[PDB]
Amino acid sequence: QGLTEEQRMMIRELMDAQMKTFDTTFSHFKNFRLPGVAAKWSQVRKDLCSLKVSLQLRGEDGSVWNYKPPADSGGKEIFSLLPHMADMSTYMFKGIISFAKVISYFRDLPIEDQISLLKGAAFELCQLRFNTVFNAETGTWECGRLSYCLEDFQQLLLEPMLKFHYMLKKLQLHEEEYVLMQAISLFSPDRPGVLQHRVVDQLQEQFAITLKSYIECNRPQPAHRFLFLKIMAMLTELRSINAQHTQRLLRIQDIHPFATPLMQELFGITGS
Ligand SMILES: C[C@H]1CCC[C@H](O)CCCCCc2cc(O)cc(O)c2C(=O)O1
Numbered sequence: 159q160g161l162t163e164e165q166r167m168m169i170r171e172l173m174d175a176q177m178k179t180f181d182t183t184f185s186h187f188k189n190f191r192l193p194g195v196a197a198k199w200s201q202v203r204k205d206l207c208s209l210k211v212s213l214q215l216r217g218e219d220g221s222v223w224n225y226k227p228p229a230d231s232g233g234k235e236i237f238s239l240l241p242h243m244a245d246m247s248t249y250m251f252k253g254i255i256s257f258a259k260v261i262s263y264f265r266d267l268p269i270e271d272q273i274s275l276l277k278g279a280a281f282e283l284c285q286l287r288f289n290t291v292f293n294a295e296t297g298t299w300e301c302g303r304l305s306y307c308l309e310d311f312q313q314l315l316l317e318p319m320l321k322f323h324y325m326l327k328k329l330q331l332h333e334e335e336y337v338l339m340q341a342i343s344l345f346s347p348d349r350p351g352v353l354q355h356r357v358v359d360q361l362q363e364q365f366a367i368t369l370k371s372y373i374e375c376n377r378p379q380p381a382h383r384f385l386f387l388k389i390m391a392m393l394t395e396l397r398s399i400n401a402q403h404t405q406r407l408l409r410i411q412d413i414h415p416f417a418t419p420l421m422q423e424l425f426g427i428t429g430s
Contacts, residue, residue: 160375165368172337175260179253180287184302190245193225193238202413205406206236208317213242214305227309240416248418250284257283258344263361271354278349280424281400283340285322290336294327318399326392329385334372341365343393366390 159166181187193213213225228235258264258276267275291300297308308314315321331339347359370386377385407425411417417427 161368161371165371168364168368169334169338169372171262172341173334175257176333176337176340178260179256181253182291182302184249184304187246187249187301187304190249191241193227193242198409198413202410203230203232203236205410209319210309211306212309213239214307216303216305218303234414237414237416240410240414244416244418244421247284248420250287251280251420251424253287254280254283257340261341261344264344267354267357271352271358274349274351274353275344275346275358277351277424277426278346279344281403282343282396285319285396285399286326286336286340286343289323289326290333292323292327294324318395319403322392322395322399329388329392331389332376335369335389338365338369338372339389339393342369343396346397 161169207230210227212227215223215225217223227239230236255276258272264272264275288299292298293300297314299306308320315324342362342365345358345362345365347355347362352358369389373382373386404425407417411425411427417425421427422429
């Protein structure tokens with residue numbers, strides 16, 4: 159530990175906010191919907207089938223419910239999982255909003271910038287949180303009583319969202335590094351509508367400096383050489399994935415509405 163007291167303060171506050179707002183066992187994700195018991199269109203079908211997962215639900219009693227999805231057959235069967243995705247996204251978004259609200263640097267910003275920043279980074283922070291429950295040996299997001307398994311190989315790693323999760327997992331990051339990644343991405347001075355550009359940008363530079371310093375003080379191994387720079391590269395990829403997934407959500411929403419009120423707020427949809 160070769161960190162200043164201000165740096166150690168910074169990490170402690172981020173770890174504290176994370177502890178208070180990340181429900182790592184997904185105990186409070188309840189009441190969710192489940193799948194039941196024209197070139198815009200080949201595109202939306204292209205958009206959807208890029209992520210095919212089976213779904214598993216462990217009962218508090220030992221029973222297991224298990225869902226294998228339909229093959230693509232040219233109709234509305236690719237839409238059966240969207241309400242559940244939306245309920246999960248919404249649940250994750252709430253934890254992310256609570257995370258920002260606990261952070262002092264975030265609270266001190268004007269409220270119009272708090273909103274602009276949350277709109278910009280919510281998806282990225284959710285992806286970063288999801289990577290900590292991702293099991294790269296089994297292709298599985300383990301969310302408590304609830305598992306999302308990738309369905310059958312290396313063609314799968316061609317999907318950028320999936321390549322990002324495998325690569326980020328291989329770096330074997332600490333809890334401290336994940337939360338500093340959340341901070342850096344949350345405090346991004348160039349999101350649409352940010353007014354305090356210079357303030358946000360100085361905050362960002364401090365969170366990045368803390369992370370570089372944390373790595374230099376606690377990871378001397380030749381396996382973590384350039385680790386800080388690999389992390390910054392992943393954050394750049396993640397912002398690109400973020401933009402690609404936003405256009406792809408809006409295309410689907412344009413022809414089959416599914417977004418919850420909170421998703422509409424975050425993605426700028428007004429209800430008219
Ligand atoms: C566990 C989470 C990881 C998303 C990570 C990345 O977004 C990977 C994309 C995999 C999405 C898996 C998934 C499919 C689905 O139909 C409904 C869902 O709620 C999820 C889902 O919640 O995936």
